[PDB]
Amino acid sequence: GPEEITADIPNVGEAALSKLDESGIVYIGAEVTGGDILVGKVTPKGETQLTPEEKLLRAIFGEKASDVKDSSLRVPNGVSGTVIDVQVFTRDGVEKDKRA
Amino acid sequence: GVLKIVKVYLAVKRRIQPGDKMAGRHGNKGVISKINPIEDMPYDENGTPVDIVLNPLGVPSRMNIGQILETHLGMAAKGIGDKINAMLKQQQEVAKLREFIQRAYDLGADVRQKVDLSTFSDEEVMRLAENLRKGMPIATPVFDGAKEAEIKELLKLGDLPTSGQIRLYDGRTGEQFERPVTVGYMYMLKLNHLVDDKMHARSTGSYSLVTQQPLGGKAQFGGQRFGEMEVWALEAYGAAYTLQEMLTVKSDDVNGRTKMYKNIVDGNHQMEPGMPESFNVLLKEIRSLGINIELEDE
Amino acid sequence: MNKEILAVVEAVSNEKALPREKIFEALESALATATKKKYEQEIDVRVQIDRKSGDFDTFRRWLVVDEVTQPTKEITLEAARYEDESLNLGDYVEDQIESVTFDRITTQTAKQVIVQKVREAERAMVVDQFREHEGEIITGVVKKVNRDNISLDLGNNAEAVILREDMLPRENFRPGDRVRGVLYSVRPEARGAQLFVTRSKPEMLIELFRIEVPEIGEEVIEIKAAARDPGSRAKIAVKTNDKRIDPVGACVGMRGARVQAVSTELGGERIDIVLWDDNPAQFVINAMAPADVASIVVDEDKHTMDIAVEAGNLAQAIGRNGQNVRLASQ
Amino acid sequence: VPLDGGRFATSDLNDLYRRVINRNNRLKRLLDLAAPDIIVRNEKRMLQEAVDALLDNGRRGRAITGSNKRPLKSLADMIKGKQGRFRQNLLGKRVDYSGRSVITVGPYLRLHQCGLPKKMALELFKPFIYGKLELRGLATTIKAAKKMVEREEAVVWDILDEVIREHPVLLNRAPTLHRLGIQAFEPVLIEGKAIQLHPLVCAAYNADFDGDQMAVHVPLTLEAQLEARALMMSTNNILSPANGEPIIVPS
Amino acid sequence: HYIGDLVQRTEVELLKTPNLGKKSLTEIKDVLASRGLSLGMRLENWPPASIADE
Amino acid sequence: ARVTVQDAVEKIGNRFDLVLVAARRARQMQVGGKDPLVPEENDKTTVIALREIEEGLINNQILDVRERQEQQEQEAAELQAVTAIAEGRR
Amino acid sequence: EFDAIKIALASPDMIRSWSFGEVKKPETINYRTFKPERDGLFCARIFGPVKDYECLCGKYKRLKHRGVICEKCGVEVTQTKVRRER
Amino acid sequence: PAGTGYAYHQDRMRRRAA
Amino acid sequence: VTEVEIDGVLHEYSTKEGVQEDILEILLNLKGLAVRVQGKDEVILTLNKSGIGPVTAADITHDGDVEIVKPQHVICHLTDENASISMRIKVQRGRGYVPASTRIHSEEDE
RNA sequence: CCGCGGCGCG
Ligand SMILES: [Mg+2]
Ligand SMILES: [Zn+2]
């Protein structure tokens, strides 16, 4: 399946998911420290089975995201400082976000 | 096979910090040891504190005499700008500056460089003088160095002692040293071998997958790599248990380290000898070639 | 309409086990709580959610009080005259109504909380089967290990727990053992409700007096007393109803059918039943079995009897820790 | 290895096994077809030489292509040479509970002591920290202690001083020459990222102050500390093991 | 007209007008969410005793 | 405090035996707590052993004789404990 | 846990006594469901489960599920560490 | 069997393996 | 001064139209700026000015006890006709030397 | 993560 950039990561605090915009990219000029999150990225976890939660809650919500594997990019330890720039390229024929 | 790339550029305003790598222009490589408050370093009779303290003992051993001459020029050079700073601060008339600067550029022997400020301007001359406040810049061709007598003559244009050393007072003591010391203005570089990104340590993290040892490199939390030379160095001592501990528990014995980790937090410090599976791995590789190898007993 | 709610209600292997509106009420309230948490203004939601035809809706409760309780959707007496003079402390009328929310972040909150609500529905079904008889003689097998107790990943749509004293101490409920007994207390345990198998209580060991002999539970064995230590031993007076025969052997079984077999699931205890008769002396002599009574006396003016006994082979007449005399006077 | 995008890289041995099993399958099919002897000789010879390459790369057949023009790593490669198994992984290991940095002078520092950055102490001795805080009862779980130490409460420094006050540490310079190439000391905490050192020891190390790096290792067991304090103390060694000359000359 | 005038009425007396809409009653919770109104606030007339800047 | 081990070395004429006996002694202090035999100055048991051995009242056989008398005492204590347990039923 | 080391040439019968099966397929891993193929260079009935105490069919996920081999997959119920030596 | 471990191994080959 | 709130900027490494210096030069210039104060202790400064020419501390709007020892000290330089510069300056009283890195201990308002 | 080469430092 296709990997996706999003402003949503499970099992993390809203403090981590606060520097991000709605499109999942940290604000320009936001101060950052070690261990923080840069861009929320999620990858298809693979169904591989169906549980009662996946039997019902997925059907009840209708949201077929549904349980997804996190691959978000985190600050490497030791380094800190301030973000100066965000540069993005998308492959031709693919949608683009607001910061682009 | 890729959708998008996100590039992030991040910046660090990193300052000096003791232990950094520092150097000049004559192979006088060095390292900053300690930063001390201003009053501690020696200061002249005029109150100005020196900035850099260097060891003279590197000079005769390495025959780097030229940096001493460069120091004498630097003291000589900054002397010119200061008086110019004194002249312009008290808003004197420009012709007083002119001849003084005219004294500077006609000094020395019959050098090919000839200038006449009277032909330049007035306001541009004033602007040059303002730009000249931080010491009058001098240059010398590579194999055409100015003679020592010329250096002394240029010092005579300034108001500093001919020999080029000054009596200094130490803030802790407050007394003159027994021997006068040469001071000046050195040009100092800076090196990318920063101490902070050299510094790295590793308590406990991931391990290899093919074998079960920690990795290397400051990135991804690598550990120090213990080489063979120092293994024989410990072997020169009676460091039996140290060597066994370090080569078994904290390197290979997966079950052993976990037990000790339980033991350490429990206040126990008893080592558990085990079986180096890296040897077992190698064993199986030897078994891979169709040659039987085995352990005789317990 | 969405009709996915209708499909979920007609899933229906786990949907029909609970009510058809169980998903439309409990899981809907969980989703409303997840949406309220996803909202910075934490509005209390009395979810008006129905799965009749697919119109998944909601409602925000007023939480009407004289204060700022649920301040995101609160009401007060400062609008009582604007609320038809019916605003006081206690009301939870619908202040607002939500419409829809995809809310992938609240989908993570759903995996945290609505999944816990699915587990809560599982717990509700678990409590409906752990003690469905409100106390009865049932069995139990241990499959999970827990400290300071005996866990059991067993049936009855739930788990089971055995106390260190409610079960056999020397043989706890563990891998390779089973228990049997009656426990009328089934409260909410960890990760949902759980059952209780305890083969050391009186309703487990002493209850074998009507389940061990071939005619014990058919009202053919007048078991006058059922006293037993927890998985240790027993010495009680069991007689035969309208038979006038020696029922000590009947309570002990024929050739070892109820002596070493009445407490097999209790921890392997060794017991010895007592005898009785139509006279008031033989019963008193045998109630402290093994007891040898060469004399008997009783006073009808006070609650004090004189069951004389020897001391040579009558160590159970007085007991080192009350093993036969304690179950004798009663 | 699960690289980016679900692509998988692996050792060359996998490719050798793949080609060997493929050629074996082709041969065992060719047994049933009963091909003429010219055909079967080619099959058996290329199978034999592929097995040969699996045992030893490139010595005859020049199987020099894994990545283009980069020879595939064989089983003979797995043991032979510096980057094999013995010299690469058995005599020399990688260890945790260790660090490295640049050196500097300590003039106030006594001979039987070494400088030490505080940050390495906090990072390194955390297993000792976890037990002692639990001993003090300030922490309750390993999770609690780990969370508490990572916010650097002011109370942790006293306990860290306690656990380090009577513990020895090892100093080793990477270009190891001789027995004095490793020493042991009783550390003192100094702010910074450098390491202070007693200058008289520096002559024994034959180490400059031009930016030389060196490493630290820490013993754990009781007997480890006892051996360290019995033998590798600087005070223990004041004569060269090579000859009866002292090694404490002011330089 | 003052923020202490709407807060001069307590959490009960501020119901002088029922002309406010249904959303306004929901918007009345924002005054409660302001932690200064709809809680029993009672100023002197405009300002309270703690609103003095003397 | 303690800086060197030369006194202990001149006491026990082997550097290697010194570390062994000290490790054993420190093992009985740290695990299975007993008392030290010398006033301490807020130091761990490792230094404490060096104080103890340098005072000339612990050596290898002193530990040996103390351990064997302790083990025979606890064996005797186990004997009376077992006899008392048997007599409890009697 | 030893006192001596012996080295010698091997016999094919005792070699297969080490062996727990023959590899027959050159396929390494199934795509889009990353599990090994039967009798491939990677395998579970030959070498072991990737997940600890979880058969490929996944009908045994329990500590007391010990040593049993499923009928759907000929895979033991044991931690993956045995794959280091099998 | 060189340093402090020699004392252990001296016991090792003496007690057993002899 | 301890911190600045230049309006038309996001971080000290970017620039703003109409200024012939970068923000770092601004920071160092105000670093070399000195003030006088008696009564208040956390005074706040600001400035609004347009036009082409030098920028000096005398251009700062004054206060009661807020004074400038050297009012002719240059701050920056403007070159564009319509390049209205604007900021507010936060000044603190203290002692000794303290780096900006150590302010990370706040961790709740910065 | 797996390795080849390069550069630099000591
Ligand atoms: Mg060097
Ligand atoms: Zn399976």
Are B116 and B79 found together in one domain? yes
d(CA G67, CA F16) in angstroms, rounded, equals: 49
Q: Which of C97, C22, C36, C59 is CA-nearest to residue A60?
A: C22
Look up the protein residue whose alpha carbon has the minimum distance to the C1' of J8.
B193
d(CA D18, CA C264) in angstroms, rounded, equals: 60
Beta-carbon contacts of C277 under 8 Å, excluding residues fewer than 6 positions away, are C283, C286
Are C119 and C133 found together in one domain? no
Are C16 and C100 found together in one domain? yes
Residues forming beta bridges with residue I3, ordered by sequence position = I90
| CB proximity under 8 Å: B 233-272 to H | 235, 237-241, 244
Q: Which residue has the tokens 């949907």?
A: C15
d(CA C224, CA C218) in angstroms, rounded, equals: 15
What amino acid is encoded at C172 in this protein? N
The CA distances from residue F39 to B41, H17, I76, in Å, are 46, 44, 70
Beta-carbon contacts of I67 under 8 Å, excluding residues fewer than 6 positions away, are I35, I36, I37
Q: Report CA(B211)–ligand 2 centroid distance (Å).
A: 27
Are B138 and B234 found together in one domain? no
Q: Which residue has the tokens 């030389």?
A: D212
Full 3-state SS string of chain D: CECHHHCECCCHHHHHHHHHHHHHHHHHHHHHHCCCHHHHHHHHHHHHHHHHHHHCCCCCCCCCCCCCCCCCCCHHHHHCCCCCCHHHHHCCEECCCEEEEEEEECCCCCCCEEEEEHHHHHHHCHHHHHHHHHHHCCCCCHHHHHHHHCCCCCCHHHHHHHHHCCCCEEEEECCCCCHHHEEEEEEEEECCCCEEECHHHHHHHCCCCCCCEEEEECCCCHHHHHHHHHHCECCCCCECCCCCCECCCCC
Q: Is the Cβ–Cβ distance between D98 and B224 less than 8 Å?
A: yes
Q: How far is the CA of C281 from the C1' of J10 (A)?
A: 105
Look up the protein residue whose alpha carbon has the minimum distance to the C1' of J5.
D70
d(CA F18, CA H3) in angstroms, rounded, equals: 12
d(CA D193, CA D182) in angstroms, rounded, equals: 21
The CA distances from residue B193 to B19, B264, D102, in Å, are 10, 37, 10
Burial class (CB in 10 A: 0-12, 13-18, 19+), I73: middle
Which structural domain, as residue segments, surrounds residue C137?
129-197
Q: Which residue has the tokens 């900054």?
A: B78
DSSP classification of residue C207: G
D3 touches strand J (CB under 7 A): yes
| Rg over CA atoms, chain C | 31
DSSP classification of residue C64: B
In this structure, the dihedral spanned by the alpha carbons of residues B144, B150, B154 and B156, taken in order and rounded to 10 degrees, is: 170
In this structure, the dihedral spanned by the alpha carbons of residues I85, I90, I96 and I102, taken in order and rounded to 10 degrees, is: -100
- In whole angstroms, what separates CA A96 from the centre of its chain? 15
Point out the nucleotide closest to D9 (alpha carbon to C1′).
J2
B223 vs D87, D96, D134: nearest CB: D96
HSE of D24 in the Cβ direction (CA atoms, 13 Å)? 12
Burial class (CB in 10 A: 0-12, 13-18, 19+), C146: middle
Q: Alpha helices, DSSP H only, in chain E?
A: 3-6, 22-33
Detail the DSSP E strand segments found in chain G.
5-9
- Pairing relation of β-strands D182-190 and D213-217? unpaired
Are B248 and B111 found together in one domain? no
d(CA C229, CA C292) in angstroms, rounded, equals: 23
D11 touches strand J (CB under 7 A): yes
Q: How far is the CA of B253 from the C1' of J2 (A)?
A: 23
- Pairing relation of β-strands D195-197 and D98-105? parallel
d(CA B258, CA D96) in angstroms, rounded, equals: 13
d(CA C282, CA I77) in angstroms, rounded, equals: 121
Are B248 and B298 found together in one domain? yes
What amino acid is encoded at C135 in this protein? G
Are C151 and C83 found together in one domain? no
CB pairs under 8 A between A and I: 12
HSE of A59 in the Cβ direction (CA atoms, 13 Å)? 22
d(CA E14, CA E5) in angstroms, rounded, equals: 10
Q: Is the Cβ–Cβ distance between F21 and F29 less than 8 Å?
A: no
The Cα angle at residue C10 between residues C5 and C16, in degrees rounded to 5: 115
d(CA I13, CA D241) in angstroms, rounded, equals: 58
DSSP classification of residue B43: B
Its sign, for the CA torsion D67, D69, D71, D72, is: positive
* Conformational region of residue B216, where left means phi above 0, alpha means psi within -120 to 50, and beta covers everything else: beta
Are B180 and B231 found together in one domain? no
Beta-carbon contacts of D115 under 8 Å, excluding residues fewer than 6 positions away, are D104, D106, D109, D187, D188, D190, D194, D195, D196, D197
Q: Is the Cβ–Cβ distance between A3 and A81 less than 8 Å?
A: no
Q: Report CA(D210)–ligand 1 centroid distance (Å).
A: 5
Q: Which residue has the tokens 């340098």?
A: F54
d(CA C133, CA C124) in angstroms, rounded, equals: 16
Do F and E make contact via 3 or more CB pairs under 8 A? The reply is no
Tell me the two tokens of residue C207.
């209850």
Point out the nucleotide closest to D3 (alpha carbon to C1′).
J1
Tell me the two tokens of residue D79.
């043991």
Nearest CA in chain B to F30: B268
Neighbours of C328 (CB within 10 A): 26
SS3 B8: strand
B210 touches strand J (CB under 7 A): yes
Which resolution in angstroms does this entry have?
Answer: 4.1
- G26–D18 CB contact, under 8 Å: yes
* Cβ-count burial B204-236 (b if 16+ within 10 Å, e if not): beebeeebbbbbeebeebbbbbbbebbbebbeb
What amino acid is encoded at A92 in this protein? D
d(CA C288, CA C323) in angstroms, rounded, equals: 8
d(CA C250, CA G26) in angstroms, rounded, equals: 72
Assess whether the previous peptide bond of A66 is cis (omega < 30° from 0).
Answer: yes
| CB proximity under 8 Å: B 102-141 to H | none
Are C133 and C117 found together in one domain? no
Its sign, for the CA torsion E19, E25, E31, E37, is: positive
Phi, psi of A94 (to 5 degrees): -125, 145
Full 3-state SS string of C143-197: CCCCCCCEEECCCCCCEEEECCCCCCCCCCCCCCCEEEECCCCCCCCCCCCEECC
d(CA C97, CA C50) in angstroms, rounded, equals: 13
Assess whether the previous peptide bond of C12 is cis (omega < 30° from 0).
Answer: yes
Tell me the two tokens of residue C56.
């998944």
A60 vs C8, C105, C108: nearest CB: C8
Q: Is the Cβ–Cβ distance between C78 and C70 less than 8 Å?
A: no
Q: Which of D142, D131, D127 is CA-nearest to residue D97?
A: D127
Which structural domain, as residue segments, surrounds residue F63?
1-89
Which structural domain, as residue segments, surrounds residue I72?
1-110
Q: Which of C277, C280, C315, C309 is CA-nearest to residue C292?
A: C309
Residues forming beta bridges with residue I53, ordered by sequence position = I78
The CA distances from residue D155 to A91, B265, D124, D139, in Å, are 53, 18, 17, 12
| Domain CATH number, residue B158 | 2.40.270.10
Q: Which residue has the tokens 């501390």?
A: I57
d(CA C78, CA E32) in angstroms, rounded, equals: 10
Tell me the two tokens of residue F23.
């490790």
Tell me the two tokens of residue B177.
């040293």
d(CA E20, CA B118) in angstroms, rounded, equals: 87
Helices H5-15 and F15-30: angle between axes, nearest 10 degrees = 90
Are C193 and C158 found together in one domain? yes
Beta-carbon contacts of I19 under 8 Å, excluding residues fewer than 6 positions away, are I26, I76, I77, I78, I79, I83, I85
d(CA C106, CA C84) in angstroms, rounded, equals: 36
Q: Is the Cβ–Cβ distance between C77 and C69 less than 8 Å?
A: no
| Domain CATH number, residue F77 | 3.90.940.10
Q: Which residue has the tokens 């179950």?
A: C327
HSE of I69 in the Cβ direction (CA atoms, 13 Å)? 6
| Rg over CA atoms, chain D | 29
Q: Which of I37, I42, I15, I10 is CA-nearest to residue I26?
A: I15
Full 3-state SS string of D8-44: ECCCHHHHHHHHHHHHHHHHHHHHHHCCCHHHHHHHH
Q: Is the Cβ–Cβ distance between C60 and C34 less than 8 Å?
A: no
DSSP classification of residue I17: T
- In whole angstroms, what separates CA D197 from the centre of its chain? 24
Measured distance between the N- and C-terminal CA atoms of chain E, rounded to whole angstroms = 22
Beta-carbon contacts of I28 under 8 Å, excluding residues fewer than 6 positions away, are none
SS3 C126: helix
Q: Is the Cβ–Cβ distance between B78 and B46 less than 8 Å?
A: no
Its sign, for the CA torsion C96, C100, C105, C107, is: positive
Q: How far is the CA of F60 from the C1' of J4 (A)?
A: 58
Residues forming beta bridges with residue I89, ordered by sequence position = I4, I45
Q: Is the Cβ–Cβ distance between B189 and B24 less than 8 Å?
A: yes
| Domain CATH number, residue C188 | 2.40.50.140
d(CA D126, CA B261) in angstroms, rounded, equals: 11
Q: Is the Cβ–Cβ distance between D78 and D85 less than 8 Å?
A: yes
Q: Structural domain tally of chain I?
A: 1
- Pairing relation of β-strands D182-190 and D113-117? parallel
Are B176 and B292 found together in one domain? no
Q: Report CA(G30)–ligand 2 centroid distance (Å).
A: 16
Are C47 and C106 found together in one domain? yes
* Cβ-count burial I10-44 (b if 16+ within 10 Å, e if not): eebbeebebbebebeebeebbeebebeeeeeeebe
SS3 B11: strand
Its sign, for the CA torsion C130, C132, C135, C136, is: negative
This entry's atomic model was obtained through: cryo-EM
Q: Is the Cβ–Cβ distance between I71 and I57 less than 8 Å?
A: yes
Neighbours of E42 (CB within 10 A): 13
SS3 C252: helix
DSSP classification of residue B143: T
What amino acid is encoded at B47 in this protein? G
Q: Is the Cβ–Cβ distance between D220 and B260 less than 8 Å?
A: yes
Phi, psi of B79 (to 5 degrees): -60, -35
DSSP classification of residue I54: E
List binding-site positions of G. 55, 57, 70, 73
D174 touches strand J (CB under 7 A): yes
d(CA C264, CA C171) in angstroms, rounded, equals: 11
Q: Structural domain tally of chain F?
A: 1
D212 touches strand J (CB under 7 A): yes
Q: Is the Cβ–Cβ distance between C70 and C43 less than 8 Å?
A: yes
d(CA C183, CA C201) in angstroms, rounded, equals: 8
d(CA A8, CA A24) in angstroms, rounded, equals: 7
Beta-carbon contacts of C33 under 8 Å, excluding residues fewer than 6 positions away, are C45, C113
d(CA D87, CA E23) in angstroms, rounded, equals: 78
B208 touches strand J (CB under 7 A): yes
Its sign, for the CA torsion C303, C309, C311, C316, is: negative
Nearest CA in chain D to B234: D179
The CA distances from residue A63 to A49, A56, A59, C15, in Å, are 17, 11, 8, 19
CATH superfamily, domain A1-94, is: RNA polymerase II, Rpb2 subunit, wall domain (2.40.50.150)
Q: How far is the CA of D210 from the C1' of J9 (A)?
A: 11
Tell me the two tokens of residue D207.
């180490």
Q: Is the Cβ–Cβ distance between C228 and C263 less than 8 Å?
A: yes
d(CA C228, CA B161) in angstroms, rounded, equals: 113
SS3 B31: strand
d(CA F48, CA A15) in angstroms, rounded, equals: 50
Positions 186-205 in B, CB within 7 angstroms of strand J: 193
